[PDB]
Amino acid sequence: QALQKYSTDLTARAREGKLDPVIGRDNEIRRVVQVLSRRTKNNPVLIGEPGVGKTAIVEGLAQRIVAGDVPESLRDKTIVALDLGSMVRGEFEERLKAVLDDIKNSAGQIITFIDELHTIVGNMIKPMLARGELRLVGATTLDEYRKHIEKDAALERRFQQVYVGEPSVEDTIGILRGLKDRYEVHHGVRITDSALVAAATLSDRYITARFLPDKAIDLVDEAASRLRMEIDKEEVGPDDIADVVSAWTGIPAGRLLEGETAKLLRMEDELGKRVIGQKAAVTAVSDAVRRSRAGVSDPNRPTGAFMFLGPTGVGKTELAKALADFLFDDERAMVRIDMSEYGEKHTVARLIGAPPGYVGYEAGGQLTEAVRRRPYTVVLFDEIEKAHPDVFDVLLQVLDEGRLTDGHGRTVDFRNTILILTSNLGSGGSAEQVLAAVRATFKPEFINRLDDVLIFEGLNPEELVRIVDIQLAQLGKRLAQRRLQLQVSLPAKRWLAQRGFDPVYGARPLRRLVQQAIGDQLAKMLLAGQVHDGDTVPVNVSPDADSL
Amino acid sequence: QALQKYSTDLTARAREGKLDPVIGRDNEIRRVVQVLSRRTKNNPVLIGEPGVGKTAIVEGLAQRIVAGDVPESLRDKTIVALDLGSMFEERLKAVLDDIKNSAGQIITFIDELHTIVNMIKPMLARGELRLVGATTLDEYRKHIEKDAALERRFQQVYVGEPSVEDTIGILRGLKDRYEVHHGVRITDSALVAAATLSDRYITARFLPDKAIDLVDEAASRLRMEIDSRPVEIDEVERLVRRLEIEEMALSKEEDEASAERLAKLRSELADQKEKLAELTTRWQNEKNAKEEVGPDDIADVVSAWTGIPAGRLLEGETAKLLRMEDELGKRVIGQKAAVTAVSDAVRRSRAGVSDPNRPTGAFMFLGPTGVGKTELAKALADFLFDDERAMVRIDMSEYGEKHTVARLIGAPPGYVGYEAGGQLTEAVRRRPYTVVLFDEIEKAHPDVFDVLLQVLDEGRLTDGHGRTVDFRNTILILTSNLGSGGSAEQVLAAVRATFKPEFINRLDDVLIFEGLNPEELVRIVDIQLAQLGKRLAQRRLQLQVSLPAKRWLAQRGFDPVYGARPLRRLVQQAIGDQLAKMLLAGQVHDGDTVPVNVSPDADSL
Ligand SMILES: Nc1ncnc2c1ncn2[C@@H]1O[C@H](COP(=O)(O)OP(=O)(O)OP(O)(O)=S)[C@@H](O)[C@H]1O
Ligand SMILES: Nc1ncnc2c1ncn2[C@@H]1O[C@H](COP(=O)(O)OP(=O)(O)OP(O)(O)=S)[C@@H](O)[C@H]1O
Ligand SMILES: Nc1ncnc2c1ncn2[C@@H]1O[C@H](COP(=O)(O)OP(=O)(O)O)[C@@H](O)[C@H]1O
Ligand SMILES: Nc1ncnc2c1ncn2[C@@H]1O[C@H](COP(=O)(O)OP(=O)(O)O)[C@@H](O)[C@H]1O
């Protein structure tokens, strides 16, 4: 009572009701009060993620004390918190010893409470502990406890671990609707259970950084305040919260709705916006992804295991680069592993990395280490027909059971990824001998487990226009830093085709071909003159090359 | 009422009407009042960097407060500050008691509380003062990011700098106040040029005050040059005066070796004397037919800042860059494909076309040894800085260990080597314009690659202290000799299987040098012999080599497995050996020229 400047009270202000009723989490209080009444290894410590309700539990304990529900062994005691940030090189221990003296002079069982004790731990308080005068209650997280309370601890023999995992959705919903009338008078508009459950599920779904009991309340109170500030609609609602979540993340409030039909029905041209032609292919792949996400197939299998073959450079990779954007929300999600190194017997274990203590161990495997983190990729396999006939064992093990075991000992799961097996077979075969070749080259019962084996059709010599038009409308962005406009002339743009297609490399060069030509040919004018940001820069076909 | 002395006021200054120009940031003000009208985690803190305009944000907040645009809980709120120009712990009770007795109507604004955080924390846990904060992001993360004891009452509010179309209005709202001291005119041309030019180029400070300091320094520079003789009329005159005194002290030199230094200092004087006259004559033209700020002094102050060149078209730099592919062919021979590529990416930066958030160029060339994959980078650094010593060259052969990543980043605070700073970061933090050479990238530990993966497409990286140096105006070069025997597929596969494809992704064109041939070797023999003459011109012993001699040389050392170094070895072993045999045996004393000629096998001097 003499040095009460680096610590607060919990039972005094509980005579005022300055604390929230603590509905939920009625088991942890029994656990704590049971550990607090032993003879040794008493004075527990709460262990859990930040923002889950550890302080909430200790406050509820204080409130049950002031009410009177505990055994008389614990009856008639106060609780005091400790702020570690109020002290901090040195003199931290001076104030700490001044505090411990007061605690000992308390001459009773006046229980303390220390939040984030792993800032203290040490050998200064253990004699205070192993004598029977203080009782501390703590708080930290699991990995912290494993660091500051496990390596140099030697005090783990007097701290009891109590776990506070995290609430469920249907439980934090009750928590919220219990903590509702408060804000209904603080701001005061109106509250709908629809808004509450919407906040809960949307935070759970898209806010993957924080945790539930406060993560939800954050959005609820911020949205209520935004609605109050609006009055410079007299109700709150689910859209009234999706707008907040969108202003929080960046993704628009439209897509923040149904994610099954509103996705399967988008498998239309929204793919064909980035991919071109091959409409049979896109429709087939869309069937594959739709009927697989229905919810009747075996739950332990990839979400798609189709392959496609034919000519090069027509967009074989581009279909996957676009598909990763629509489903997993990124084009930096695919992983491509060439089956050209894997032409020997031994190198098949390079994509796992076998033993602890050999050359490639901490480097992990090529196929697994890129999956156990971010398990939502889109795996490609260039020129699979060249891989040694031993990789197929690992591959069949994948697509027959959604699991695999790396070198470390971890278990990885492939039950929500998409396999893709490209190939350059089909040199002359149109549709007749190409399938005979791919039925005789690969194992016959392997292809029994695949999905559709669709064959890309060549670029229609007219349907080079759409791809080059996408390329050109893209490069229309290039010189927007100067706002210079571009000229198009269908003879010139078609003159790129017959001299840049090169159907041995698909359509690969048509990016450098045009960017180097236009950019570094204008690089004289763009420095001297001849152009400004209203000039379409008329470029045309000289009888030989592409002058202006 | 006892804080009227220890703190200023903004409830009365706003009624009187004096406040700095606040335009924009109205959504920010709305965010601040919105977070103030909450139950928990209210009372925000502003996060940014010095000179973004959060001071202006709170000032406009105060003006809007006195005007009235508020909710019910904001009955003018009499927002005040707590003067950090008021500084002991016995007085702070007297300061805090006034706010404590109040009902939350005198809320404070702790400008730069980053150092304030015992006394304010318990008085915050009861919830009586707002204590509006404003600091920077790194100091925030250091001080009040790890302490969750107080992070339950602080909601950071991010702010950005650029408001270009209103930065010009701010310049206007300040243009009046900068024309008073400097007897100059600050034109809208200058406003709109500085608002538009120093933004991407001088990327060390931030627009809302760097666009201010540019105009301030331009004003001071012009006011200086309004004095009779201006810049470049005060320069060659100070040069020619000094040059003369260097000549009148060399005539009285009884030496023959200093005559050739007297025979040149005279000439450069005779060359500089004219250009003094030509400018002086043209001066009177403008004297009877600069007195105002424009767009040229802007680029002037840009160039004099951070060494970065950023002008309209700098009238001495025009024919150099169109001659680059040819000007570079004086030092590097062959690899037309490589010189075209390395060249087409310097103009696209001096033109303003290239991507503004990526290095001004970053790509790799590799191939057999003794081809020039290092002389090319050296030649590049020689004609941009005019001295080859001005290239940052780090070797990746010493970084073969994992724990050597902290060698070029620095060691964390509290360890032994801490004040020494980094090795790569500490060179690009101060004066970033150089070219950085990565010798033998293959020999490095395949973990430093994860740092260049950051530098690519982001343009910066962090060090042991936590700050971020910028990498947006340099060129990054990679050298290696993977494969070294394969045509094009072995080396392609080797680099593809040695580096991540998402590291080769952000790279520009990947270059493969060919190797030298007989037709390109005579041009190298000439360079070698010219450099050798320039070297042994310190004893005035010029040489005289015959065409059969140069052909014998260029034929002798050619073998297409080691490149060109055998040529230097043969030059030494065949000429310098004999010459140094004679030079200390008398008979070839200073001031001499010895001819060489082909003999049947050797070439006698
Ligand atoms: N059962 C509950 N009853 C009432 N409020 C609860 C309950 N569980 C969580 N909360 C609230 O959730 C929020 C989380 O606050 P804290 O309990 O302090 O978080 P924490 O889990 O203790 O970790 P810290 O201390 O925030 S780092 C507070 O507003 C609590 O009041
Ligand atoms: N095309 C060239 N232009 C200029 N100097 C050249 C050329 N080819 C060779 N040389 C000279 O020959 C030597 C080769 O220098 P480097 O460029 O370091 O060799 P390299 O090609 O880098 O091979 P490595 O892999 O670095 S050992 C230097 O003395 C160069 O000056
Ligand atoms: N249908 C298409 N839609 C869009 N771009 C396409 C299409 N077909 C080919 N392309 C383009 O052709 C080029 C080759 O892409 P890709 O098939 O990934 O090449 P590679 O086979 O060399 O890996 C890319 O620029 C790609 O955008
Ligand atoms: N939007 C604005 N336009 C023009 N001048 C401004 C604006 N906001 C503030 N100013 C003035 O310019 C100064 C720029 O520095 P300031 O914004 O105070 O930086 P800080 O408070 O972060 O140190 C302000 O102090 C103010 O006097």
Side-chain angles (χ1 to χ4, degrees), chain B residues 226-240:
Chain B
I226 277 177
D227 176 283
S228 159
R229 293 212 286 270
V231 170
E232 83 256 8
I233 310 292
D234 198 76
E235 308 319 287
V236 191
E237 64 178 6
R238 287 256 184 69
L239 182 141
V240 296

mmCIF file with all atom_site columns, all heavy atoms in Angstrom, chain B residues 226-240:
data_model
loop_
_atom_site.group_PDB
_atom_site.id
_atom_site.type_symbol
_atom_site.label_atom_id
_atom_site.label_alt_id
_atom_site.label_comp_id
_atom_site.label_asym_id
_atom_site.label_entity_id
_atom_site.label_seq_id
_atom_site.pdbx_PDB_ins_code
_atom_site.Cartn_x
_atom_site.Cartn_y
_atom_site.Cartn_z
_atom_site.occupancy
_atom_site.B_iso_or_equiv
_atom_site.pdbx_formal_charge
_atom_site.auth_seq_id
_atom_site.auth_comp_id
_atom_site.auth_asym_id
_atom_site.auth_atom_id
_atom_site.pdbx_PDB_model_num
ATOM 1   N N   . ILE B 1 226 ? 22.613 37.187 -58.640 1.00 0.00 ? 226 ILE B N   1
ATOM 2   C CA  . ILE B 1 226 ? 22.200 38.527 -59.046 1.00 0.00 ? 226 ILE B CA  1
ATOM 3   C C   . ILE B 1 226 ? 23.312 39.530 -58.794 1.00 0.00 ? 226 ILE B C   1
ATOM 4   O O   . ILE B 1 226 ? 23.441 40.509 -59.537 1.00 0.00 ? 226 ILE B O   1
ATOM 5   C CB  . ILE B 1 226 ? 20.888 38.933 -58.337 1.00 0.00 ? 226 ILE B CB  1
ATOM 6   C CG1 . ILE B 1 226 ? 19.687 38.354 -59.081 1.00 0.00 ? 226 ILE B CG1 1
ATOM 7   C CG2 . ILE B 1 226 ? 20.753 40.436 -58.214 1.00 0.00 ? 226 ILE B CG2 1
ATOM 8   C CD1 . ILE B 1 226 ? 18.372 38.652 -58.416 1.00 0.00 ? 226 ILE B CD1 1
ATOM 9   N N   . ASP B 1 227 ? 24.139 39.296 -57.777 1.00 0.00 ? 227 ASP B N   1
ATOM 10  C CA  . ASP B 1 227 ? 25.383 40.038 -57.640 1.00 0.00 ? 227 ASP B CA  1
ATOM 11  C C   . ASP B 1 227 ? 26.157 39.944 -58.948 1.00 0.00 ? 227 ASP B C   1
ATOM 12  O O   . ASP B 1 227 ? 26.126 38.903 -59.612 1.00 0.00 ? 227 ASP B O   1
ATOM 13  C CB  . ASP B 1 227 ? 26.209 39.503 -56.471 1.00 0.00 ? 227 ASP B CB  1
ATOM 14  C CG  . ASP B 1 227 ? 27.552 40.176 -56.357 1.00 0.00 ? 227 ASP B CG  1
ATOM 15  O OD1 . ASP B 1 227 ? 28.456 39.839 -57.147 1.00 0.00 ? 227 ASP B OD1 1
ATOM 16  O OD2 . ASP B 1 227 ? 27.706 41.055 -55.487 1.00 0.00 ? 227 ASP B OD2 1
ATOM 17  N N   . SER B 1 228 ? 26.880 41.013 -59.292 1.00 0.00 ? 228 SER B N   1
ATOM 18  C CA  . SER B 1 228 ? 27.314 41.303 -60.657 1.00 0.00 ? 228 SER B CA  1
ATOM 19  C C   . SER B 1 228 ? 27.731 40.074 -61.450 1.00 0.00 ? 228 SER B C   1
ATOM 20  O O   . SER B 1 228 ? 27.134 39.778 -62.489 1.00 0.00 ? 228 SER B O   1
ATOM 21  C CB  . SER B 1 228 ? 28.475 42.300 -60.637 1.00 0.00 ? 228 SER B CB  1
ATOM 22  O OG  . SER B 1 228 ? 29.214 42.228 -61.844 1.00 0.00 ? 228 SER B OG  1
ATOM 23  N N   . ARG B 1 229 ? 28.727 39.349 -60.972 1.00 0.00 ? 229 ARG B N   1
ATOM 24  C CA  . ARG B 1 229 ? 29.147 38.217 -61.784 1.00 0.00 ? 229 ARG B CA  1
ATOM 25  C C   . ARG B 1 229 ? 28.443 36.958 -61.321 1.00 0.00 ? 229 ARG B C   1
ATOM 26  O O   . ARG B 1 229 ? 28.550 36.591 -60.144 1.00 0.00 ? 229 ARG B O   1
ATOM 27  C CB  . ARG B 1 229 ? 30.660 38.036 -61.722 1.00 0.00 ? 229 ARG B CB  1
ATOM 28  C CG  . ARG B 1 229 ? 31.416 39.188 -62.378 1.00 0.00 ? 229 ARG B CG  1
ATOM 29  C CD  . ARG B 1 229 ? 32.719 38.732 -63.007 1.00 0.00 ? 229 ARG B CD  1
ATOM 30  N NE  . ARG B 1 229 ? 33.747 38.438 -62.015 1.00 0.00 ? 229 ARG B NE  1
ATOM 31  C CZ  . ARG B 1 229 ? 34.614 39.329 -61.545 1.00 0.00 ? 229 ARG B CZ  1
ATOM 32  N NH1 . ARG B 1 229 ? 34.591 40.576 -61.991 1.00 0.00 ? 229 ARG B NH1 1
ATOM 33  N NH2 . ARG B 1 229 ? 35.516 38.969 -60.641 1.00 0.00 ? 229 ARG B NH2 1
ATOM 34  N N   . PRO B 1 230 ? 27.701 36.300 -62.201 1.00 0.00 ? 230 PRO B N   1
ATOM 35  C CA  . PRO B 1 230 ? 26.966 35.097 -61.800 1.00 0.00 ? 230 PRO B CA  1
ATOM 36  C C   . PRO B 1 230 ? 27.809 33.837 -61.881 1.00 0.00 ? 230 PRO B C   1
ATOM 37  O O   . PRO B 1 230 ? 29.017 33.897 -62.135 1.00 0.00 ? 230 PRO B O   1
ATOM 38  C CB  . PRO B 1 230 ? 25.808 35.063 -62.800 1.00 0.00 ? 230 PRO B CB  1
ATOM 39  C CG  . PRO B 1 230 ? 26.402 35.643 -64.033 1.00 0.00 ? 230 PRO B CG  1
ATOM 40  C CD  . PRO B 1 230 ? 27.406 36.682 -63.591 1.00 0.00 ? 230 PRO B CD  1
ATOM 41  N N   . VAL B 1 231 ? 27.172 32.689 -61.658 1.00 0.00 ? 231 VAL B N   1
ATOM 42  C CA  . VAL B 1 231 ? 27.792 31.381 -61.838 1.00 0.00 ? 231 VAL B CA  1
ATOM 43  C C   . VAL B 1 231 ? 28.262 31.277 -63.286 1.00 0.00 ? 231 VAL B C   1
ATOM 44  O O   . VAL B 1 231 ? 27.755 31.987 -64.158 1.00 0.00 ? 231 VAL B O   1
ATOM 45  C CB  . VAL B 1 231 ? 26.804 30.261 -61.456 1.00 0.00 ? 231 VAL B CB  1
ATOM 46  C CG1 . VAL B 1 231 ? 27.317 28.881 -61.846 1.00 0.00 ? 231 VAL B CG1 1
ATOM 47  C CG2 . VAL B 1 231 ? 26.504 30.312 -59.967 1.00 0.00 ? 231 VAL B CG2 1
ATOM 48  N N   . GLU B 1 232 ? 29.283 30.448 -63.528 1.00 0.00 ? 232 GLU B N   1
ATOM 49  C CA  . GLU B 1 232 ? 29.904 30.189 -64.829 1.00 0.00 ? 232 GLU B CA  1
ATOM 50  C C   . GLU B 1 232 ? 30.423 31.476 -65.461 1.00 0.00 ? 232 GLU B C   1
ATOM 51  O O   . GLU B 1 232 ? 30.871 31.480 -66.611 1.00 0.00 ? 232 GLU B O   1
ATOM 52  C CB  . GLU B 1 232 ? 28.955 29.449 -65.786 1.00 0.00 ? 232 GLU B CB  1
ATOM 53  C CG  . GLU B 1 232 ? 27.946 30.287 -66.553 1.00 0.00 ? 232 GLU B CG  1
ATOM 54  C CD  . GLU B 1 232 ? 26.544 30.168 -65.996 1.00 0.00 ? 232 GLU B CD  1
ATOM 55  O OE1 . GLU B 1 232 ? 26.380 29.558 -64.920 1.00 0.00 ? 232 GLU B OE1 1
ATOM 56  O OE2 . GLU B 1 232 ? 25.607 30.698 -66.625 1.00 0.00 ? 232 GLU B OE2 1
ATOM 57  N N   . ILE B 1 233 ? 30.384 32.563 -64.702 1.00 0.00 ? 233 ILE B N   1
ATOM 58  C CA  . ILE B 1 233 ? 31.084 33.793 -65.040 1.00 0.00 ? 233 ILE B CA  1
ATOM 59  C C   . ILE B 1 233 ? 32.019 34.049 -63.874 1.00 0.00 ? 233 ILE B C   1
ATOM 60  O O   . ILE B 1 233 ? 32.987 34.808 -63.983 1.00 0.00 ? 233 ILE B O   1
ATOM 61  C CB  . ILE B 1 233 ? 30.116 34.966 -65.276 1.00 0.00 ? 233 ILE B CB  1
ATOM 62  C CG1 . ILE B 1 233 ? 29.002 34.555 -66.238 1.00 0.00 ? 233 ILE B CG1 1
ATOM 63  C CG2 . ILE B 1 233 ? 30.857 36.173 -65.831 1.00 0.00 ? 233 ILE B CG2 1
ATOM 64  C CD1 . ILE B 1 233 ? 29.480 34.310 -67.649 1.00 0.00 ? 233 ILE B CD1 1
ATOM 65  N N   . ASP B 1 234 ? 31.727 33.404 -62.747 1.00 0.00 ? 234 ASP B N   1
ATOM 66  C CA  . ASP B 1 234 ? 32.593 33.410 -61.581 1.00 0.00 ? 234 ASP B CA  1
ATOM 67  C C   . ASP B 1 234 ? 33.472 32.173 -61.507 1.00 0.00 ? 234 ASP B C   1
ATOM 68  O O   . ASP B 1 234 ? 34.238 32.028 -60.548 1.00 0.00 ? 234 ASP B O   1
ATOM 69  C CB  . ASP B 1 234 ? 31.759 33.519 -60.304 1.00 0.00 ? 234 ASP B CB  1
ATOM 70  C CG  . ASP B 1 234 ? 32.574 33.971 -59.111 1.00 0.00 ? 234 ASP B CG  1
ATOM 71  O OD1 . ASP B 1 234 ? 32.888 35.176 -59.026 1.00 0.00 ? 234 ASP B OD1 1
ATOM 72  O OD2 . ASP B 1 234 ? 32.912 33.120 -58.264 1.00 0.00 ? 234 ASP B OD2 1
ATOM 73  N N   . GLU B 1 235 ? 33.379 31.278 -62.486 1.00 0.00 ? 235 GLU B N   1
ATOM 74  C CA  . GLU B 1 235 ? 34.092 30.011 -62.435 1.00 0.00 ? 235 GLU B CA  1
ATOM 75  C C   . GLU B 1 235 ? 35.314 29.976 -63.333 1.00 0.00 ? 235 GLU B C   1
ATOM 76  O O   . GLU B 1 235 ? 36.419 29.711 -62.852 1.00 0.00 ? 235 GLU B O   1
ATOM 77  C CB  . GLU B 1 235 ? 33.154 28.865 -62.810 1.00 0.00 ? 235 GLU B CB  1
ATOM 78  C CG  . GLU B 1 235 ? 31.864 28.870 -62.017 1.00 0.00 ? 235 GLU B CG  1
ATOM 79  C CD  . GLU B 1 235 ? 32.080 29.204 -60.552 1.00 0.00 ? 235 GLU B CD  1
ATOM 80  O OE1 . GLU B 1 235 ? 32.599 28.344 -59.813 1.00 0.00 ? 235 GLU B OE1 1
ATOM 81  O OE2 . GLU B 1 235 ? 31.724 30.322 -60.130 1.00 0.00 ? 235 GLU B OE2 1
ATOM 82  N N   . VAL B 1 236 ? 35.148 30.243 -64.628 1.00 0.00 ? 236 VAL B N   1
ATOM 83  C CA  . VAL B 1 236 ? 36.305 30.203 -65.510 1.00 0.00 ? 236 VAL B CA  1
ATOM 84  C C   . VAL B 1 236 ? 37.252 31.346 -65.190 1.00 0.00 ? 236 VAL B C   1
ATOM 85  O O   . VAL B 1 236 ? 38.464 31.234 -65.406 1.00 0.00 ? 236 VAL B O   1
ATOM 86  C CB  . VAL B 1 236 ? 35.866 30.221 -66.983 1.00 0.00 ? 236 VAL B CB  1
ATOM 87  C CG1 . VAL B 1 236 ? 37.044 29.900 -67.881 1.00 0.00 ? 236 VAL B CG1 1
ATOM 88  C CG2 . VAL B 1 236 ? 34.743 29.229 -67.206 1.00 0.00 ? 236 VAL B CG2 1
ATOM 89  N N   . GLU B 1 237 ? 36.736 32.449 -64.653 1.00 0.00 ? 237 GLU B N   1
ATOM 90  C CA  . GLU B 1 237 ? 37.618 33.528 -64.232 1.00 0.00 ? 237 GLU B CA  1
ATOM 91  C C   . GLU B 1 237 ? 38.511 33.109 -63.075 1.00 0.00 ? 237 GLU B C   1
ATOM 92  O O   . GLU B 1 237 ? 39.714 33.389 -63.095 1.00 0.00 ? 237 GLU B O   1
ATOM 93  C CB  . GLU B 1 237 ? 36.799 34.759 -63.854 1.00 0.00 ? 237 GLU B CB  1
ATOM 94  C CG  . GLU B 1 237 ? 35.887 34.561 -62.665 1.00 0.00 ? 237 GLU B CG  1
ATOM 95  C CD  . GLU B 1 237 ? 35.141 35.814 -62.306 1.00 0.00 ? 237 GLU B CD  1
ATOM 96  O OE1 . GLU B 1 237 ? 35.258 36.801 -63.057 1.00 0.00 ? 237 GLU B OE1 1
ATOM 97  O OE2 . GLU B 1 237 ? 34.448 35.826 -61.269 1.00 0.00 ? 237 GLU B OE2 1
ATOM 98  N N   . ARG B 1 238 ? 37.953 32.435 -62.069 1.00 0.00 ? 238 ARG B N   1
ATOM 99  C CA  . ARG B 1 238 ? 38.747 31.903 -60.974 1.00 0.00 ? 238 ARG B CA  1
ATOM 100 C C   . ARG B 1 238 ? 39.671 30.791 -61.426 1.00 0.00 ? 238 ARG B C   1
ATOM 101 O O   . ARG B 1 238 ? 40.706 30.562 -60.793 1.00 0.00 ? 238 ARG B O   1
ATOM 102 C CB  . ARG B 1 238 ? 37.836 31.383 -59.865 1.00 0.00 ? 238 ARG B CB  1
ATOM 103 C CG  . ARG B 1 238 ? 37.165 32.479 -59.078 1.00 0.00 ? 238 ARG B CG  1
ATOM 104 C CD  . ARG B 1 238 ? 37.818 32.657 -57.724 1.00 0.00 ? 238 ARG B CD  1
ATOM 105 N NE  . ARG B 1 238 ? 37.125 33.648 -56.908 1.00 0.00 ? 238 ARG B NE  1
ATOM 106 C CZ  . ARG B 1 238 ? 35.914 33.478 -56.391 1.00 0.00 ? 238 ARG B CZ  1
ATOM 107 N NH1 . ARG B 1 238 ? 35.246 32.352 -56.598 1.00 0.00 ? 238 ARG B NH1 1
ATOM 108 N NH2 . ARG B 1 238 ? 35.367 34.436 -55.662 1.00 0.00 ? 238 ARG B NH2 1
ATOM 109 N N   . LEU B 1 239 ? 39.323 30.107 -62.508 1.00 0.00 ? 239 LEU B N   1
ATOM 110 C CA  . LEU B 1 239 ? 40.184 29.088 -63.080 1.00 0.00 ? 239 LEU B CA  1
ATOM 111 C C   . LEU B 1 239 ? 41.350 29.707 -63.844 1.00 0.00 ? 239 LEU B C   1
ATOM 112 O O   . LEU B 1 239 ? 42.499 29.298 -63.658 1.00 0.00 ? 239 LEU B O   1
ATOM 113 C CB  . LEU B 1 239 ? 39.357 28.179 -63.990 1.00 0.00 ? 239 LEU B CB  1
ATOM 114 C CG  . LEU B 1 239 ? 40.049 26.998 -64.660 1.00 0.00 ? 239 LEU B CG  1
ATOM 115 C CD1 . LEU B 1 239 ? 39.120 25.804 -64.661 1.00 0.00 ? 239 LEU B CD1 1
ATOM 116 C CD2 . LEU B 1 239 ? 40.432 27.360 -66.072 1.00 0.00 ? 239 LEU B CD2 1
ATOM 117 N N   . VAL B 1 240 ? 41.078 30.704 -64.688 1.00 0.00 ? 240 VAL B N   1
ATOM 118 C CA  . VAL B 1 240 ? 42.133 31.258 -65.534 1.00 0.00 ? 240 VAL B CA  1
ATOM 119 C C   . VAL B 1 240 ? 43.101 32.088 -64.706 1.00 0.00 ? 240 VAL B C   1
ATOM 120 O O   . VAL B 1 240 ? 44.296 32.159 -65.014 1.00 0.00 ? 240 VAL B O   1
ATOM 121 C CB  . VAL B 1 240 ? 41.535 32.078 -66.691 1.00 0.00 ? 240 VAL B CB  1
ATOM 122 C CG1 . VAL B 1 240 ? 40.714 31.187 -67.605 1.00 0.00 ? 240 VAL B CG1 1
ATOM 123 C CG2 . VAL B 1 240 ? 40.710 33.231 -66.166 1.00 0.00 ? 240 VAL B CG2 1
#
